[PDB]
Design a protein around this ligand. Structure first.
Ligand SMILES: Cc1ccc(C(=O)NC2CC2)cc1-n1cnc2ccc(N3CCN(C)CC3)cc2c1=O
Length: 341
């Protein structure tokens, strides 16, 4: 057991191992406050997130469990993983706090504001990371610039995947980058919700503008159909909702724009890949693996260095347990954590 020390940082008491020094608030992450810190053991800069009231309710407790399990499983360069997890609790009965320690990247894509080459490298990394999480049947669901962490090398990791509700978790998504299908629940969804997000992000990297800055669900939908065209009979067949079909066919029928007119003077391959990401029909949207093999990524693509993940057990997601059952499960996961080399 390590030596802990306490420290007031903006409202709450942080209690952390002495190996972590110079704690420095950097605002909110998902479900808690994050400090940058210096790890004296490794000489690394790290992000430390203290979860906010992890066991206050079934939602908090389950989501504490989910986040921890997610982090422990991720071993991939373009996906955030777990350097350390600690609690100041000496036993289960006083277990009330969970701290999660990862690499500290130093910026995000939301700050960034980029030549065609940077876009290539950056989107390549997103897709490579996405291929890895999709293979373990984990989906991000709220991929967006603010959770794409990058360092001054343009190296990139994805954060905050697996947290947004499947079909509550208390996680707050950002409208502008969501696949229309999961925003309007208008048709079943799959892993390619994240590919739409990649589309919106890639578009913003090339033009400087948010592609679809809607003020609500309906405005947003209006902006999307202005680009991609109102769907024909083929896609309209696949939508159950009487009202979603109403909206689509009631807005004046929009023709599909030429993507070369919108993403002016972009690499034609960039344009082409956008055309394959930003299609309304989820069954026809390009996957992460297929997008990696696209010609736009020829300087970066390597079939033997685009790994998939080991099988991730998430049968727990379908379980309705008490807070204390989730808590014990979390505590087990904490006690059995082995650091990386
Ligand atoms: C610590 C941590 C734990 C877990 C996870 C995570 O992805 N979990 C899911 C299972 C995938 C992520 C992080 N993490 C890592 N580095 C960061 C670096 C900076 C920041 N800010 C910087 C900008 N400010 C305005 C706002 C916030 C937050 C973070 C941050 O939340």
């Amino acid at each position: 057991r390590p030596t802990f020390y306490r420290q007031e940082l903006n409202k709450t008491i942080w209690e952390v191992p002495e190996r972590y020094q110079n704690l420095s608030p950097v605002g909110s992450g998902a479900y808690g406050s994050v400090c940058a810190a210096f790890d004296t053991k490794t000489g690394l800069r790290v992000a430390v997130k203290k979860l906010s009231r992890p066991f206050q309710s079934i939602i908090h407790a389950k989501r504490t469990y989910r986040e921890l399990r997610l982090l422990k499983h991720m071993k991939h360069e373009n996906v955030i993983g777990l350097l350390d997890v600690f609690t100041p609790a000496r036993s289960l009965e006083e277990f009330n706090d969970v701290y999660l320690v990862t690499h500290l990247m130093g910026a995000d894509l939301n700050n960034i504001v980029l030549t065609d080459d940077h876009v290539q490298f950056l989107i390549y990394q997103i897709l490579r990371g996405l291929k890895y999480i999709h293979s373990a049947d984990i989906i991000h669901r709220d991929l967006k610039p603010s959770n794409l962490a990058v360092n001054e090398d343009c190296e990139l990791k994805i954060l905050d995947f697996g947290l947004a509700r499947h079909t509550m978790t208390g996680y707050v998504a950002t409208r502008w980058y969501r696949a229309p299908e999961i925003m309007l629940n208008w048709m079943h969804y799959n892993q390619t919700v994240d590919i739409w997000s990649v589309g919106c992000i890639m578009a913003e990297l090339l033009t400087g503008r948010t592609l679809f800055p809607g003020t609500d669900h309906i405005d947003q939908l209006k902006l999307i159909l202005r680009l991609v065209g109102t769907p024909g009979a083929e896609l309209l067949k696949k939508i159950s909702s009487e009202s979603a079909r109403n909206y689509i066919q009631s807005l004046t029928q929009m023709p599909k724009m030429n993507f070369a007119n919108v993403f002016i003077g972009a690499n034609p391959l960039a344009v082409d890949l956008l055309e394959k990401m930003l299609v309304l029909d989820s069954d026809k949207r390009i996957t992460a693996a297929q997008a990696l093999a696209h010609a736009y990524f020829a300087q970066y693509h390597d079939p033997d260095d685009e790994p998939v993940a080991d099988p991730y057990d998430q049968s727990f997601e379908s379980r309705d347990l008490l807070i204390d059952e989730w808590k014990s499960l979390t505590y087990d996961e904490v006690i059995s954590f082995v650091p990386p080399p």
